[PDB]
């Protein structure tokens, strides 16, 4: 929203955010590359790794 908010103004144009950031799906892909812990403020019922 900020990018197309300033996706104007030929004085200082901008790169698309795909280079300066990951995408969310790209994050959640790379978050399957590492053993991960999720702490959260409620009661999960029962399973392994839990």
């Amino acid at each position: 929203a900020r990018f197309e908010n300033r996706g104007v103004d030929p004085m200082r144009p901008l790169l698309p955010p795909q280079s300066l950031w990951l995408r969310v799906d790209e994050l959640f892909s790379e978050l399957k590359n590492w053993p991960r812990v999720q702490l959260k403020t409620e009661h999960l019922p029962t399973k392994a790794a839990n």
């Binding site: 197309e4 908010n5 300033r6 996706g7 104007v8 103004d9 030929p10 004085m11 200082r12």
Partner: protein, 50 residues
């Protein structure tokens, strides 16, 4: 020939150019440009042919 001499093909940079020729400097956004152009000629407040 006005289409040829125009450095603008899409509407947002047209509103940018309108914003800059009305008020130079102050690097524009989308919403400032759309607001300025919409209140310039299409607002019952600041523009009224009798």
């Amino acid at each position: 020939e006005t289409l040829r001499v125009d450095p603008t093909n899409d509407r947002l940079s047209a509103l940018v150019e309108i914003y800059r020729m009305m008020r130079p400097g102050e690097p524009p956004t989308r919403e400032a440009a759309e607001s300025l152009f919409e209140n310039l000629f299409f607002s019952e407040d600041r523009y009224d042919l009798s």
